[PDB]
Amino acid sequence: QFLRTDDEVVLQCTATIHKEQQKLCLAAEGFGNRLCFLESTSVPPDLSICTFVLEQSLSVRVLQEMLANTVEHRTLLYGHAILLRHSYSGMYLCCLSTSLAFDVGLQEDTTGEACWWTIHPASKQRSEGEKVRVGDDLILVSVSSERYLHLSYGNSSWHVDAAFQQTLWSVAPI
């Protein structure tokens, strides 16, 4: 199985502190504070706010060409830029302007780079143009900021931001 546009997916990462390993899912609420957060699994507590739709998958060339021109169920491929729609709120996973690391949250407007993320293999091989398989670990790079979608630990909890270091994500259907 390959990842396809209009696939409905969960984004998961592995979090290990003090030898305690867990799986976390990217989540966000409909309303209020727009920031993404993370939920421990075991299946998250509230699954319907962890749901995203792979809405578009375009080459960076095409995306940037499309944006430049305004200035006056396809298989996902490594190196393409994707748009992730939050099912519940209808808004988009986006790299925010505000804080080394930026916030990751939800916004309506996709006409810009902030809502686009390029997909890259975990391995040292670049695998550019090759199909993304279910089971592959992904690195996700913000098109606007060039930062990675990143797992961070605070004082007591795990957070997601856009940072200078990489995190591996499992993007799995259902």
Q: What does the alpha-carbon distance between residue 56 and residue 84 come to, in Å, rounded to a whole number?
A: 8
Q: What is the dihedral of CA 11, 87, 140, 100, to 10 degrees?
A: -100
Please provide the DSSP assignment of 8-26 as one string. Answer: EEEEEEEEEETTEEEEEEE
Amino acid at 9: V
β partners of residue 24:
13, 40
- Looking only at the bridges linking them, the beta strands covering 148-153 and 158-163 are antiparallel
What approach was used to elucidate this structure?
X-ray
**What are the Cα distances from residue 99, in Å, to 103, 125, 160, 161?**
6, 32, 12, 9
SS3 118: strand
Q: Which domains does the chain possess?
A: 1-174 (2.80.10.50)
Q: Identify the H or E element spanning 97.
A: none
Amino acid at 117: W
- Compute the C-alpha angle 71/34/10, nearest 5°: 95
Asked if residue 169 lies in contact with residue 140, where contact means CB atoms within 8 angstroms, the answer is yes
SS3 49: helix
Q: What does the alpha-carbon distance between residue 24 and residue 13 come to, in Å, rounded to a whole number?
A: 5
Please provide the DSSP assignment of 133-165 as one string. Answer: BTT-EEEEEETTT-PEEEEEE-SSSEEEEEESS
Stated length of the chain: 174
Amino acid at 65: E
Enumerate residues 6+ apart whose C-beta is below 8 A from 137. Answer: 121, 122, 168, 169, 170
